[PDB]
Design a protein around this ligand. Structure first.
Ligand SMILES: Nc1nc2c(ncn2[C@@H]2O[C@@H]3COP(=O)(O)O[C@H]4C[C@H](Oc5ccncn5)C[C@@H]4COP(=O)(O)O[C@@H]2[C@@H]3O)c(=O)[nH]1
Lengths: 181, 181
């Protein structure tokens, strides 16, 4: 069942990343210059993409870690897509707390196809076991990294954060990637 | 390569159809009662989903047929999704012209995963030929129909329109499905 995660990764590139990454720096600059609080640190460049290998993808990031707190939305990106006039692509900005204080600010989200792998393992008609789910999650991330390595749209625009939970700190995991830049 | 279209279909259900179909009747009623022109026909119930087996999915439906013309958007559906606060699900309403006159009004769009199958066949690193694309497109539609047949979310909410181009009239193809209701 190689083909499942392979297709989901290509889908994620074709239907999302290649569309939004080219416009993301401009959107962040606009946020930083026009909407961001005058007294706060700039939003980091780059979309940070969370890849939990157990495909546990909560809708609310504050569920996964208290130290990750919603700050604001970027300006919306819209475009006609497959018969939908002005389909909306939206991204959320988070503050990352270290010792009750802001250590970082970045555009952050989960790779939503990992939600599909999770659900497919829960639905009997999908014919996809829980054991194949880790293997698929890993294959998804490899394929995605292979794609972005060749992608002209990835111009230091994008950072993948793969992780496994065995207390694990997600905010620390993100701060580690954020400080490397 | 059974697994490609299989996963894309499940993804389409999990990440879209199961989320929007339950709320679609309410959204259409709201449009019909509050936003729709007093003197026009009601928008049909049901989301009409175009499935061109050649995976030719233009962004603008007026490209595919002059007689299909954008009228309006439904009210937006929003929800927190995978770390994105207020991700937007948007649908477009079209008028369908027969002899220069309005014969029908419906919420209409293409199945966007067919765009992924198309693009995957164009990108060398995807390892997916044009010949496998028809087979995958067919498998996508079968899997989707299998899912919706068991789906509690599909409550006469949803109509699949599969077709192949050999002049073919898309608006007629849609009017045929629309008049069956
Ligand atoms: N028409 C229509 N189809 C939709 C819509 N939303 C999802 N779908 C389709 O549902 C399936 C599963 O969705 P996922 O969210 O798990 O995966 C997505 C995640 C990412 O997209 C975004 C977009 C905005 N913000 C975050 N991520 C790329 C990937 C593929 O996205 P698509 O190529 O658009 O197709 C998908 C896919 O086939 C919609 O609003 N309209």
């Amino acid at each position: 069942n190689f083909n499942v995660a392979h297709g989901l990764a290509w889908s994620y590139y074709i239907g999302y990343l290649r569309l939004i990454l080219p416009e993301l720096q401009a959107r962040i600059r606009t946020y930083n210059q026009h909407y961001n609080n005058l007294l706060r640190g700039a939003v980091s460049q780059r979309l940070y993409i969370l890849l939990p290998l157990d495909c546990g993808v909560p809708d609310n990031l504050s569920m996964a870690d208290p130290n990750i707190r919603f700050l604001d939305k970027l300006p919306q990106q819209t475009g006609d897509r497959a018969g939908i006039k002005d389909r909306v692509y939206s991204n959320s900005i988070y503050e990352l707390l270290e010792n009750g204080q802001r250590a970082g600010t970045c555009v952050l989200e989960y790779a939503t196809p990992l939600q599909t792998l999770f659900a497919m393992s829960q639905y009997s008609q999908a014919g996809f076991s829980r054991e194949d789910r880790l293997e698929q999650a890993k294959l998804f991330c490899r394929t995605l990294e292979d794609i972005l390595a060749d992608a002209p749209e990835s111009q230091n625009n994008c950072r993948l954060i793969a992780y496994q939970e065995p207390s694990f700190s997600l905010s620390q995991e993100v701060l580690r990637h954020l400080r490397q830049e």
